[PDB]
Design an enzyme around this catalytic site. Structure first.
Site, PDB file in Angstrom:
ATOM      1  N   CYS A  35       6.640  -2.800 -10.237  1.00 12.39           N
ATOM      2  CA  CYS A  35       7.467  -2.218  -9.188  1.00 12.39           C
ATOM      3  C   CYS A  35       8.722  -1.605  -9.780  1.00 12.39           C
ATOM      4  CB  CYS A  35       7.870  -3.271  -8.163  1.00 12.39           C
ATOM      5  SG  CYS A  35       6.778  -3.388  -6.763  1.00 12.39           S
ATOM      6  N   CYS A  49      -2.537   6.761   4.488  1.00 15.63           N
ATOM      7  CA  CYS A  49      -3.535   6.876   3.432  1.00 15.63           C
ATOM      8  C   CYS A  49      -3.970   8.294   3.092  1.00 15.63           C
ATOM      9  CB  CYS A  49      -4.782   6.067   3.778  1.00 15.63           C
ATOM     10  SG  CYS A  49      -6.090   6.228   2.539  1.00 15.63           S
ATOM     11  N   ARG A  94      -4.658  -7.619  -8.024  1.00 12.77           N
ATOM     12  CA  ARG A  94      -5.295  -8.540  -8.951  1.00 12.77           C
ATOM     13  C   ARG A  94      -6.673  -8.103  -9.436  1.00 12.77           C
ATOM     14  NH1 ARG A  94      -1.259 -11.204  -7.412  1.00 12.77           N
ATOM     15  NH2 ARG A  94      -0.626 -13.313  -8.043  1.00 12.77           N
ATOM     16  N   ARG A 125      -9.881  13.996  10.370  1.00 16.67           N
ATOM     17  CA  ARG A 125      -9.419  12.681  10.800  1.00 16.67           C
ATOM     18  C   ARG A 125      -9.518  12.557  12.311  1.00 16.67           C
ATOM     19  NH1 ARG A 125      -9.428  10.866   6.292  1.00 16.67           N
ATOM     20  NH2 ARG A 125      -8.129   9.214   5.392  1.00 16.67           N
ATOM     21  N   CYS A 141       1.471  -2.213  -8.437  1.00 12.71           N
ATOM     22  CA  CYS A 141       2.252  -3.428  -8.209  1.00 12.71           C
ATOM     23  C   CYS A 141       1.471  -4.692  -8.561  1.00 12.71           C
ATOM     24  CB  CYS A 141       2.700  -3.508  -6.745  1.00 12.71           C
ATOM     25  SG  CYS A 141       3.368  -5.127  -6.259  1.00 12.71           S
ATOM     26  N   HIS A 178      -7.249   0.735   7.255  1.00 15.79           N
ATOM     27  CA  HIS A 178      -6.039   0.672   6.459  1.00 15.79           C
ATOM     28  C   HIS A 178      -5.122   1.857   6.692  1.00 15.79           C
ATOM     29  CE1 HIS A 178      -9.018   2.927   4.178  1.00 15.79           C
ATOM     30  NE2 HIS A 178      -8.020   3.537   3.563  1.00 15.79           N
ATOM     31  N   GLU A 179      -5.535   2.781   7.551  1.00 12.71           N
ATOM     32  CA  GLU A 179      -4.704   3.943   7.843  1.00 12.71           C
ATOM     33  C   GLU A 179      -4.261   3.885   9.302  1.00 12.71           C
ATOM     34  OE1 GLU A 179      -6.099   7.760   6.376  1.00 12.71           O
ATOM     35  OE2 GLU A 179      -5.294   8.759   8.145  1.00 12.71           O
ATOM     36  N   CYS A 220     -11.294   5.878   7.469  1.00 14.87           N
ATOM     37  CA  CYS A 220     -11.265   6.548   6.179  1.00 14.87           C
ATOM     38  C   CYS A 220     -12.500   6.146   5.377  1.00 14.87           C
ATOM     39  CB  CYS A 220      -9.984   6.161   5.430  1.00 14.87           C
ATOM     40  SG  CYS A 220     -10.079   6.279   3.640  1.00 14.87           S
ATOM     41  N   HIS A 221     -12.871   6.970   4.407  1.00 15.21           N
ATOM     42  CA  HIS A 221     -14.165   7.050   3.779  1.00 15.21           C
ATOM     43  C   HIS A 221     -14.282   5.642   3.200  1.00 15.21           C
ATOM     44  CE1 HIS A 221     -16.751   7.118   0.219  1.00 15.21           C
ATOM     45  NE2 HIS A 221     -17.428   8.075   0.829  1.00 15.21           N
ATOM     46  N   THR A 222     -13.161   5.117   2.717  1.00  9.27           N
ATOM     47  CA  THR A 222     -13.137   3.789   2.127  1.00  9.27           C
ATOM     48  C   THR A 222     -13.558   2.696   3.110  1.00  9.27           C
ATOM     49  OG1 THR A 222     -11.509   4.342   0.433  1.00  9.27           O
ATOM     50  CG2 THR A 222     -11.620   2.030   1.143  1.00  9.27           C
ATOM     51  N   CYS A 250       8.071  -7.575  -9.080  1.00 10.86           N
ATOM     52  CA  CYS A 250       7.249  -7.583 -10.288  1.00 10.86           C
ATOM     53  C   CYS A 250       7.699  -6.502 -11.284  1.00 10.86           C
ATOM     54  CB  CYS A 250       5.763  -7.403  -9.934  1.00 10.86           C
ATOM     55  SG  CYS A 250       5.315  -5.877  -9.079  1.00 10.86           S
TER      56      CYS A 250
HETATM   57  N1  NAD Z   1      -7.251   7.645  -5.222  1.00 10.25           N
HETATM   58  C1  NAD Z   1      -6.786   7.204  -4.020  1.00 10.25           C
HETATM   59  O1  NAD Z   1      -5.764   6.505  -3.935  1.00 10.25           O
HETATM   60  C2  NAD Z   1      -7.621   7.653  -2.739  1.00 10.25           C
HETATM   61  C3  NAD Z   1      -6.862   7.562  -1.513  1.00 10.25           C
HETATM   62  C4  NAD Z   1      -7.577   7.963  -0.349  1.00 10.25           C
HETATM   63  C5  NAD Z   1      -8.889   8.411  -0.295  1.00 10.25           C
HETATM   64  N2  NAD Z   1      -9.576   8.466  -1.576  1.00 10.25           N
HETATM   65  C6  NAD Z   1     -10.993   8.924  -1.707  1.00 10.25           C
HETATM   66  O2  NAD Z   1     -11.002  10.360  -1.733  1.00 10.25           O
HETATM   67  C7  NAD Z   1     -12.236  10.897  -1.154  1.00 10.25           C
HETATM   68  C8  NAD Z   1     -12.019  11.944  -0.103  1.00 10.25           C
HETATM   69  O3  NAD Z   1     -11.506  11.456   1.124  1.00 10.25           O
HETATM   70  P1  NAD Z   1     -11.718  12.241   2.532  1.00 10.25           P
HETATM   71  O4  NAD Z   1     -11.056  11.472   3.610  1.00 10.25           O
HETATM   72  O5  NAD Z   1     -11.235  13.630   2.549  1.00 10.25           O
HETATM   73  O6  NAD Z   1     -13.308  12.175   2.665  1.00 10.25           O
HETATM   74  P2  NAD Z   1     -14.459  13.132   3.231  1.00 10.25           P
HETATM   75  O7  NAD Z   1     -15.783  12.541   3.175  1.00 10.25           O
HETATM   76  O8  NAD Z   1     -14.105  13.666   4.570  1.00 10.25           O
HETATM   77  O9  NAD Z   1     -14.305  14.305   2.164  1.00 10.25           O
HETATM   78  C9  NAD Z   1     -15.291  14.771   1.215  1.00 10.25           C
HETATM   79  C10 NAD Z   1     -15.360  16.258   1.283  1.00 10.25           C
HETATM   80  O10 NAD Z   1     -15.958  16.745   0.044  1.00 10.25           O
HETATM   81  C11 NAD Z   1     -17.033  17.586   0.335  1.00 10.25           C
HETATM   82  N3  NAD Z   1     -18.085  17.504  -0.666  1.00 10.25           N
HETATM   83  C12 NAD Z   1     -19.091  16.597  -0.879  1.00 10.25           C
HETATM   84  N4  NAD Z   1     -19.873  16.918  -1.945  1.00 10.25           N
HETATM   85  C13 NAD Z   1     -19.326  18.088  -2.422  1.00 10.25           C
HETATM   86  C14 NAD Z   1     -19.665  18.947  -3.503  1.00 10.25           C
HETATM   87  N5  NAD Z   1     -20.684  18.747  -4.331  1.00 10.25           N
HETATM   88  N6  NAD Z   1     -18.884  20.058  -3.706  1.00 10.25           N
HETATM   89  C15 NAD Z   1     -17.812  20.311  -2.866  1.00 10.25           C
HETATM   90  N7  NAD Z   1     -17.430  19.583  -1.847  1.00 10.25           N
HETATM   91  C16 NAD Z   1     -18.222  18.469  -1.657  1.00 10.25           C
HETATM   92  C17 NAD Z   1     -17.501  17.232   1.743  1.00 10.25           C
HETATM   93  O11 NAD Z   1     -18.228  18.288   2.352  1.00 10.25           O
HETATM   94  C18 NAD Z   1     -16.206  16.842   2.427  1.00 10.25           C
HETATM   95  O12 NAD Z   1     -15.582  17.901   3.128  1.00 10.25           O
HETATM   96  C19 NAD Z   1     -13.049   9.664  -0.706  1.00 10.25           C
HETATM   97  O13 NAD Z   1     -14.111   9.450  -1.634  1.00 10.25           O
HETATM   98  C20 NAD Z   1     -11.982   8.552  -0.614  1.00 10.25           C
HETATM   99  O14 NAD Z   1     -12.516   7.245  -0.727  1.00 10.25           O
HETATM  100  C21 NAD Z   1      -8.942   8.094  -2.750  1.00 10.25           C
HETATM  101 ZN    ZN Z   2      -8.165   5.521   2.829  1.00 11.96          ZN
HETATM  102 ZN    ZN Z   3       5.469  -5.159  -7.039  1.00 12.12          ZN
END
Ligand code: NAD
Ligand code: ZN
Ligand code: ZN
Ligand code: NAD
Ligand code: ZN
Ligand code: ZN
Lengths: 373, 376
Positions: free
Chosen positions: A100, A175, A112, A368, A108, A64-65, A43-45, A97
C-alpha cells in the site's frame, strides 16, 4: 448492530445459475461497513465462477461492481456513517502493508492467492462470514458480494464518494470503467500523440478507449468480432474500427499496414489466445508496448525475437489504481464531465431479473446492465 | 592491403551447418560507396556465431562468421569522410544510420537499416547493393550480421562501425564489439537496474557476467548469479555477485529459491542463458507489482508467460545489443574502459592464433571459456 433480512443472488454450485434467496446479512464488525446496494452490474468475472472449467468456492454471493449508501458502520469506524455514498471494489488498499505504501504497485498485502485472485477475499478479515441463508454460511466474493440488497465489506474495499453522485452510473467505477480506463493511463501509460489499439469492445475495452483519448492519443484502433460494438466505440473516441471476421488477413497484419509499422500501445480487453497474440504482433518494433487487461486463457506465448526487438509486455490489475484514493477522484471527474459513463449503460433491470442480465451479457447484446432494487 | 585492389588473405569459412570452420584463402574486394575495409586485429567467438552452425537453426552458407572484433581501417570507399586509413574501429551488428525514425527515437537502439525482423541472424547477409565482398575458390561467400570478423580483412557498412580512441588496446576492446556491450547495456539500458535494487542473472558467460558488471554500476544492492556450471561462480562473484546458485544442486526450482531468499523476489531479472527453463524462471523469480524481466539470451523461439503474472504486476522486455545507440555509445564504452570504469581483462580466458578458431569454438561449447581472443 441488528441482523438484516434481504434478497441476494446465491450460487450454490457450478453449472447451476444464481438463485434469488432470502438471506441474513449480519451486522458489520470492527473495520467494516455494511452497504446498501443501489445499483450493481454483472461482470464477466462474475459469470466465470459458475463455469465448471473455472476454479471457485460455493455457496457464494457473487458480484463486485456496484455503488451504494452506508447502511451502518462497525466499531472504531469513523471514516464512514449511515448515508455516505460509497463504492466498494475487489482491489484493496488496507493502508497497513508494504504494498500500500509502495508507489510502484497498486497491489495490497490483504491479498493472498496470487494465482487465483478470483477465489480470494472469500471471507472477511476474521476468516468469518456475514452471510447466512437457510442455516448455511455463504462465501463472499472477491471481497465485495454486490448481488445482495445489503452487503458487508472490509473498510479496505470501499471509498466514500461525492454526495451528488448518481449511483446508477457511478457504479461502473466499481470495476469495468476503472480497469479499462486505468489500464490505458497507468499501466499502458499512453502518451500524447500516440497510436493505440484496443481489442475487445466490452465495458473494459471502451473505457480503455476513453482512457486512450484522455491520455491524448491521436489515433485509436478498435478491434472486435462484433460489429455491433463499433458505433459506441467511435462515440467514445475510436478513430478506426476493424472486424477480424471481415478481413482476409490476420487483424494484426491489417493494423501493421494501416499504420506502416504497427501501433505504439496495445491493450487487450478480450483475453483470447488469438487476441493476445495479435495485441503483441500489431505493435511497432523498438518501443512497442502491449498491455494485458482481459484474460480468458491462463497463458500467453511470446516469440523471443519480438521482445529482443523492442516490444515489451505488461498487465494491469484494477487499472493500476490505488483504489481508496483513486475511486473518489474518478467520481469527481465523471461529475465534472471529464468523461461520460452513461454511454456504457445499455440496459437496466430489476435485481430478480439478474439471469436475463447474464443472458444479454453472454449474447453479447450489451456493455453493462444496471441492476436496481 | 593496397587500396582499390582486391585483397588475398585468410578467413574461416563455414561451407555448411554441422560442419567445423575451414581456413581458406579468400579475396576481399575493395570498399564501395559508404563502406570501409578493415584489417581485423583481434576477434572472438560468440555464442551467436556457433548458433549458425547448428543444423536445426535457420542459417545461410557458405559464410564468413564472426561479429565480435576490433581493427584498423585499411581503406574507405567513394564518398566516405568519417573514416580513414589508420583509424582504430569496432564494427557491430547493430547499425545506427542516424538518418531514420528508429534512430531518432530515444526509446530504441534499432535503425531502419535492418530488414529481417524474424530471423535477424540471417539478415545483413550481403552489402547494401545486394552483393558480396567475399570470394573464395571461385565462389561468393555470405557475410554475417554485417561484420564477418573471421577474416583478416573485411568490408562493413559505415553505419556498422565506430571510430574509437587511437590508444585502445584492440585485443581487449574488441569485446565491446558485442559480448560485453550486450550484457552491460542490458542491465543499464534495457532492464534499467536502479540503486538499492535486487537483481538475478541467468547464464554466466561473457554476456551474463557483463550484465553483472552493469548491475554493479547501476548500483544494485544484491546480484544473484544463476548457472548450471559452478565453475562460473568465482568470476561472477569477482565481478559483483553477492549470491550464487546452481539449479542442478537444488531440490526446489531456482525461482522458488530466489523468491524465498529475497522474500518475494528480485526487482530486475536478466536471462543471459536463454533456455526454456531460464526464461520461465527469469520471469517467476521477480517480485509481483513491479517485477521486471529482461530477455538477453535466447536459445528458444518462444516463452510461455502466465496471464495472471502479468496482470499482477510483472512485466517483460528484451535487449538488442544492450540497447546502446551503436555509433554514439561504443566509443564511450572504450573511454570508460581506459578510465578503468570496468575490467574486460576478466572476461578473457584464452588467446589463440586465428588458425585455432575451431578450438576456441570447442572451448566455448564445452563451457571452459568466457572469451578467447583470436589474433592474425
Ligand atoms: N485486469 C483487471 O483488473 C480486469 C478488470 C476487469 C475486467 N477484466 C477482464 O477483462 C475482460 C473484458 O471485460 P468486459 O466487461 O468488457 O467483457 P465482454 O465479454 O463484454 O468483452 C469482450 C469483448 O471482446 C470481444 N471479443 C471476443 N473475442 C474477440 C476476438 N477474437 N477479437 C476481437 N474481439 C473479441 C467481444 O465481442 C466483446 O465485445 C474480461 O475477460 C474480464 O474478466 C480484467
Ligand atoms: Zn469485474
Ligand atoms: Zn494494503
Ligand atoms: N540480445 C542481444 O542483443 C544479444 C547480443 C549478444 C549475445 N546474445 C546471446 O546471449 C547469450 C549469452 O551469450 P554468451 O556469450 O555469454 O554465451 P555462452 O555460451 O558463453 O553462455 C552460456 C552460459 O549460460 C549457462 N547456462 C546454460 N543453460 C543454463 C540453465 N538452464 N540455467 C542457468 N545457466 C545456464 C551456461 O552454463 C553458460 O555459463 C547467448 O544466447 C547469445 O547468443 C544476445
Ligand atoms: Zn554476439
Ligand atoms: Zn537509423
Amino acid at each position: 448492530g441488528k441482523v438484516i433480512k434481504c434478497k441476494a443472488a446465491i450460487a450454490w454450485k457450478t453449472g447451476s445459475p444464481l438463485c434469488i434467496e432470502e438471506i441474513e446479512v449480519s451486522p458489520p464488525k470492527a473495520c467494516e461497513v455494511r452497504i446498501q446496494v443501489i445499483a450493481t452490474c454483472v461482470c464477466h468475472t462474475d459469470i466465470n465462477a459458475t463455469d465448471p472449467k473455472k476454479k471457485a468456492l460455493f455457496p457464494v454471493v457473487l458480484g463486485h461492481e456496484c455503488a451504494g449508501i452506508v447502511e451502518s458502520v462497525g466499531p472504531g469506524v469513523t471514516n464512514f456513517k449511515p448515508g455516505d455514498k460509497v463504492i466498494p471494489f475487489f482491489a484493496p488498499q488496507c493502508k497497513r502493508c508494504k504494498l500500500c505504501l509502495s508507489p510502484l504497485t497498486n497491489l495490497c498485502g490483504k491479498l493472498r492467492n496470487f494465482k487465483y485472485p478470483t477465489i480470494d477475499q472469500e471471507l472477511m478479515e476474521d476468516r468469518t462470514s456475514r452471510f447466512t441463508c437457510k442455516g448455511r454460511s455463504i462465501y463472499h466474493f472477491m471481497g465485495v458480494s454486490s448481488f445482495s440488497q445489503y452487503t458487508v465489506v472490509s473498510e479496505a474495499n470501499l471509498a466514500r464518494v461525492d454526495d451528488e453522485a448518481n449511483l446508477e452510473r457511478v457504479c461502473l467505477i466499481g470495476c469495468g470503467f476503472s480497469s479499462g480506463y486505468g489500464a490505458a493511463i497507468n499501466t499502458a501509460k499512453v502518451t500524447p500523440g500516440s497510436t493505440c489499439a484496443v481489442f475487445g469492445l466490452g465495458c473494459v475495452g471502451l473505457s480503455a478507449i476513453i482512457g486512450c483519448k484522455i491520455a491524448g492519443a491521436s489515433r485509436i484502433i478498435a478491434i472486435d468480432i462484433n460489429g455491433e460494438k463499433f458505433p459506441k466505440a467511435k462515440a467514445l473516441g475510436a478513430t478506426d474500427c476493424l472486424n477480424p471476421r471481415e478481413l482476409d488477413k490476420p487483424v494484426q497484419d491489417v493494423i501493421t499496414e494501416l499504420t506502416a509499422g504497427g501501433v505504439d500501445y496495445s491493450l487487450d480487453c478480450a483475453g483470447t489466445a488469438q487476441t493476445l497474440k495479435a495485441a503483441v504482433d500489431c505493435t511497432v518494433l523498438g518501443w512497442g508496448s502491449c498491455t494485458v487487461v482481459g484474460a480468458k486463457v491462463d497463458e500467453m506465448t511470446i516469440p523471443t525475437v519480438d521482445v529482443i526487438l523492442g516490444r515489451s509486455i505488461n498487465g494491469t490489475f484494477f487499472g493500476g489504481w490505488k483504489s481508496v484514493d483513486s475511486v473518489p477522484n474518478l467520481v469527481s471527474d465523471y461529475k465534472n464531465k471529464k468523461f461520460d459513463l452513461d454511454l456504457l449503460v445499455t440496459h437496466a433491470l430489476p435485481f430478480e431479473s439478474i439471469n436475463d442480465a447474464i443472458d444479454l451479457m453472454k449474447e453479447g447484446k450489451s456493455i453493462r446492465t444496471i441492476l436496481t432494487f
